[PDB]
Amino acid sequence: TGDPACRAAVATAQKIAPLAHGEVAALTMASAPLKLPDLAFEDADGKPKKLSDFRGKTLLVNLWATWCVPSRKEMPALDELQGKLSGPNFEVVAINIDTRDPEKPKTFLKEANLTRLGYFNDQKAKVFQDLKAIGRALGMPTSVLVDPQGCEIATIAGPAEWASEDALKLIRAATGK
């Protein structure tokens, strides 16, 4: 039984579906209403964060890890996607789930000059557990495009060229308000 508040997110998925080709071809559009679990994580300053703190904006939620090469390969594109579309209506929420050497992922972003993504993390990797339980963490990386209501619009298991024009078009269409 799909949460009725997420039926509007279902509607968006059907509109932008023709934009799910090329670089963003591996996106599986939501066909049923799905409210995401309120992922609990931290920001760069150690303050507790939840997915519901980002209510009101369309989000791209990514889970990445240092041991997952393609997850760390796509961090520039996500960073380029941020700042290009971030604003009152959109954010990329990239969450690191390294459980060991917490300094390693932090160093990755600094040494690669990726400063637009902040540093959200869950060293418990429970955010991974959260997506796995609802069939939205089939691999790493995993990324979910989430609406202002915390409802699923789409999901992709694996990396993508997020800074490409194919990627940009679907997000721009998905975005509102």
Partner: protein, 159 residues
């Protein structure tokens, strides 16, 4: 002819010999995969790692054994660098094609090469975890579709 498992001699990430007999005396998790970089990462090794982490000091009382199905690219060296991001209780095993082929037969592991279009391939595999008892006899698959706490509590029953 219908029983899961068989004899083997492989080499761990530290160059030490590990066999089916050295794995006796403890409940033993056997599972299969590869280190070498894929376009999308399988989660089995990380999930076992999280179970091992959930087990605390009891992680010592079990064997957790990761066996390459891609012997042509996986070495102790490749295993060791790869395993350094996961629980230190983990063991990653290598060998010549013939010994891996021999383990693959005994555990009925699906493993076929799948070209990854960028020029390389992915070794598509059986993602199943095999539970073996203290005598190396097949018990059952070990379920990972639950929290690492629930899986850890399950594994502690055999301790």
């Amino acid at each position: 002819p219908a029983a899961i498992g068989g004899p083997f001699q492989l080499t761990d990430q530290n160059g030490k010999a590990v066999t089916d007999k050295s794995l006796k005396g403890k409940p033993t998790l056997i599972f299969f995969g590869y280190t070498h970089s894929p376009d999308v990462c399988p989660t089995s090794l990380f999930e076992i790692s999280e179970v091992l982490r959930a087990m605390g000091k009891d992680a010592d009382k079990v064997n957790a054994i990761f066996i390459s199905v891609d012997p042509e690219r996986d070495t102790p060296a490749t295993m060791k660098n790869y395993l350094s991001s996961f629980d230190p209780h983990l063991e990653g095993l290598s060998g010549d094609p013939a010994e891996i082929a021999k383990v693959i037969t005994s555990y009925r592991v699906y493993a076929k090469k799948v070209p990854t279009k960028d020029g390389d391939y992915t070794m598509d595999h059986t993602a199943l975890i095999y539970l073996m008892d203290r005598d190396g006899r097949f018990v059952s698959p070990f379920n990972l579709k639950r929290t690492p706490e629930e899986a850890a509590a399950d594994l502690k029953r055999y301790l």
